[PDB]
Amino acid sequence: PINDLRSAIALLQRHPGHYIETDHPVDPNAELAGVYRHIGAGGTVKRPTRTGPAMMFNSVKGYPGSRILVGMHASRERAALLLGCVPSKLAQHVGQAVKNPVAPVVVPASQAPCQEQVFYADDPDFDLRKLLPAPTNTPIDAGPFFCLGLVLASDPEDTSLTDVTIHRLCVQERDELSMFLAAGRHIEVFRKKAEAAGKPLPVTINMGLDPAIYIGACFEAPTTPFGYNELGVAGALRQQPVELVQGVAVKEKAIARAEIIIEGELLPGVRVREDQHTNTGHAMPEFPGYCGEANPSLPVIKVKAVTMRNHAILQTLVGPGEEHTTLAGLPTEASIRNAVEEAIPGFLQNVYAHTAGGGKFLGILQVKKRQPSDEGRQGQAALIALATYSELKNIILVDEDVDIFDSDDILWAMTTRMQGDVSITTLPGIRGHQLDPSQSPDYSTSIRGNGISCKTIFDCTVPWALKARFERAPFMEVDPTPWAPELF
Amino acid sequence: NPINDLRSAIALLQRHPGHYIETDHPVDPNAELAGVYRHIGAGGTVKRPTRTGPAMMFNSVKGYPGSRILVGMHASRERAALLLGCVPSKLAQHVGQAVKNPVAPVVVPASQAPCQEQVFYADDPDFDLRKLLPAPTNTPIDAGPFFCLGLVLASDPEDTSLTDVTIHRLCVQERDELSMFLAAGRHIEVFRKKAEAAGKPLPVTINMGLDPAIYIGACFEAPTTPFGYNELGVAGALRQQPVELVQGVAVKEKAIARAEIIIEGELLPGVRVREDQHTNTGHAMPEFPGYCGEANPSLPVIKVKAVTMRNHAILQTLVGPGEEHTTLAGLPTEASIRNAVEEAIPGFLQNVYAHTAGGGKFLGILQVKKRQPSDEGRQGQAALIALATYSELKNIILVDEDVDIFDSDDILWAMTTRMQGDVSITTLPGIRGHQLDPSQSPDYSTSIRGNGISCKTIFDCTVPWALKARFERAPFMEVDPTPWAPELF
């Protein structure tokens, strides 16, 4: 079975094409990301690019004994393989585990591989910049970045309330990182509580994990006493609870079977400019495919210790490309699937949070009109999708005979099953997302501020009265394996 | 080493693994044949699952020992570019360059006509086209067995110096009869009217199994010269070797000397047939948009006089018509659109893709580069030129030079982050498009006055000139990734 990063790699090695290694040296500064751009970054990264194998870089220039791993989640086919289900049913699969979680468990340090090696910060030869090779994606980033930091944090007033989230961090000093916290998230509430009292907030950055943890943590989870409830998804996906170990130097727990763990605390009453040492004005590439701007006021994490297993694998991403599409798009598809199935049972067939929108901006809904009254319900499904995921932008509606994962087949529906003065409904002035650069008053007079957009529903479904005229050419059902065994 | 026929082209594909396979597993030419290749290489607008892949040779045909059927030869832009010696992105330019400097065909005696290694005359009472050629059916609801890549040669029955070569599809009707549609307004149709007026048939040759250069070049617009057969001049220019012609054996027309199979027949005047007379399925064939077409009620009949083929003749056709149609139709579409925009706006259009989702006809993708403030507003001009150039286009998408116009994911990305639905979308109602789009119906829109009329839409996904500094895609370091994974390159 799988219970950490390395056992997942073993499964990938039994399916050739999903994992490779290389011993040719590489620079973690921009060179690594530039290489994986051609191999497996995918997503919204500039062409040429493609989905490919997960990649391991064994020779890291300037970091002997370190190995960097990227693209673990940069493939919907790979992600379904890691959880054991069909790719088209992957969101439905994880959504089922969301509804029947398996709570994590605390285990002693003897069962925590993540603490085989310990490095305290108060040691005078400790330097976070020499201990870990944090890669940069572009030569214009704010600095070195960790992009897959599973952050654990508890309320300082009541430890029974926790939060499990994925963050990115920029290495600033030998013992400091900058970390943005989304306003409204529980951990940001926890941090403002501690900063209001002048106290730091202990946290753990857990990196190099079972893919089931990274994916499952992106879903919304209920709350239970001493919860860490986001981990319950991975517990249900593996039918084995996720094990936790007490931190070595902070009053917070950590993933026991993690590759690397940074223990630190959010400092009270201190901010930092994200690119203070590079002065590029930017932070790093964002999921829409453009370079985000450097945040001028970020809170600082003061590192206390770094614990890692022997021959620790540093896991991060590149792009963020298809990797971000997987981690954000599966929750997007799941919450839309639940909302529509609740409102219109048996109508929605599937949903794809398209990788062209990073799994956030573009939603493709596949419906099936079973009866005359289903005409008019496709627009209802699009309204439900927009209402469930406010950060969406455009919705495309197609029938069950369209493959929503094939963008050629989507454009085909836009071509032969659509009239621009009939099938296109615009919705101006709806709050969308700040990182879409076209959501600007400079782009449209109907946009009153940044992050507001026009939202468009493309109804490429066949009108119920005409479905007999739109049957695709019916080729005979055959098994092509005998005529070309090598292709199957 | 050079290419001058179908078999020399297959030899080139064998030197590039992935573009050609064979199978000895028996296959039924009725439906089963197309059903197999639908999974392997049909591509295009064929219903999923499908993809582009190798061209395929079926060496074992049920009930037809000694026959071998070939499909998918043009069912790939990469394969077509390799078959012509250029990169797939410049494929439309490479052919358009050869169109401007054609090499005229040359007539040769039967000594140099491999196509005439076998001859079957139709006056034999035991003659039967069904026993001779295993014409496949794409779907069980087709009007009948079909030939889909018949290169037809014909000449004016009055002024033989006026010639026309074209690509048609033919449905098998009798042991010696075929039904063949002709597009109104083309020379071979005008030739047939003159002949039918005088109560005289029109001699034609149906050339199948050709150099891909011939099939591809024949779809472009060619001039007219005395005894020219000018659409063949593109293939001659693409090979730097004139296409060889041979006088017919039973009819008054020449045939492709290097062809695999030749059907010599005549268009009988006065007689008409409906396509599905023997099947009554109401349909004819799967069309390029992806739906089954309706049977033609009145079709001119070709009465075959002789069938002519080389030893172990390969039967070439298509399936889908899928990506194979996209290649043959889209390359002319892109070329004429590119010529029109480069003339009107030099240096602006970077590339153009007759997207395979439109069958190479309905959807056009235009890649422009705004170089100066005056270029703002010219992107819509470029879309209007393409719409004016290819009236069967329905939608246009405009993208910048940093968008891969052949990557449908990348096209939807520009439509997601570089587009506002109430700013970037222009609808043009009431413009004639194409009859085979089923949404071009009054039942689909009150602004459509008749079949074949559509609303045409321009999606402007180009960054406004004033904002270009804010829409730079993330700049990843330029590297050569070969040393890190040589097995992938």
UniProtKB/TrEMBL annotation, chain A:
Residues 107-319 form the 3-octaprenyl-4-hydroxybenzoate carboxy-lyase-like Rift-related domain. The keyword Transmembrane does not apply. GO terms for molecular function: carboxy-lyase activity; metal ion binding. It holds the Pfam family UbiD_N. It comes from the Bacteria. Mn(2+) binds at residues 163, 186, 230. Keywords: Decarboxylase, Lyase, Metal-binding. Prenylated FMN binds at residues 166-168, 180, 182, 185-186, 219-220. Residues 326-460 form the 3-octaprenyl-4-hydroxybenzoate carboxy-lyase-like C-terminal domain. SUPFAM superfamilies: FMN-binding split barrel, UbiD C-terminal domain-like. Residues 14-97 form the 3-octaprenyl-4-hydroxybenzoate carboxy-lyase-like N-terminal domain. One of its GO terms (cellular component) is cytoplasm. InterPro entries: UbiD (IPR002830), UbiD-like_C (IPR049381), UbiD-like_N (IPR049383), UbiD_Rift_dom (IPR048304). The keyword Lyase applies. This is 3,4-dihydroxybenzoate decarboxylase. It comes from Enterobacter cloacae.
TrEMBL record, chain B:
Residues 327-461 form the 3-octaprenyl-4-hydroxybenzoate carboxy-lyase-like C-terminal domain. Residues 108-320 form the 3-octaprenyl-4-hydroxybenzoate carboxy-lyase-like Rift-related domain. Pfam families: UbiD, UbiD_C, UbiD_N. It comes from the Bacteria. Transmembrane segments: none annotated. Mn(2+) binds at residues 164, 187, 231. Prenylated FMN binds at residues 167-169, 181, 183, 186-187, 220-221. GO terms for molecular function: carboxy-lyase activity; metal ion binding. The keyword Metal-binding applies. Keywords: Decarboxylase, Lyase, Metal-binding. Residues 15-98 form the 3-octaprenyl-4-hydroxybenzoate carboxy-lyase-like N-terminal domain. GO terms for cellular component: cytoplasm. InterPro entries: UbiD, UbiD-like_C, UbiD-like_N, UbiD_Rift_dom. This is 3,4-dihydroxybenzoate decarboxylase.
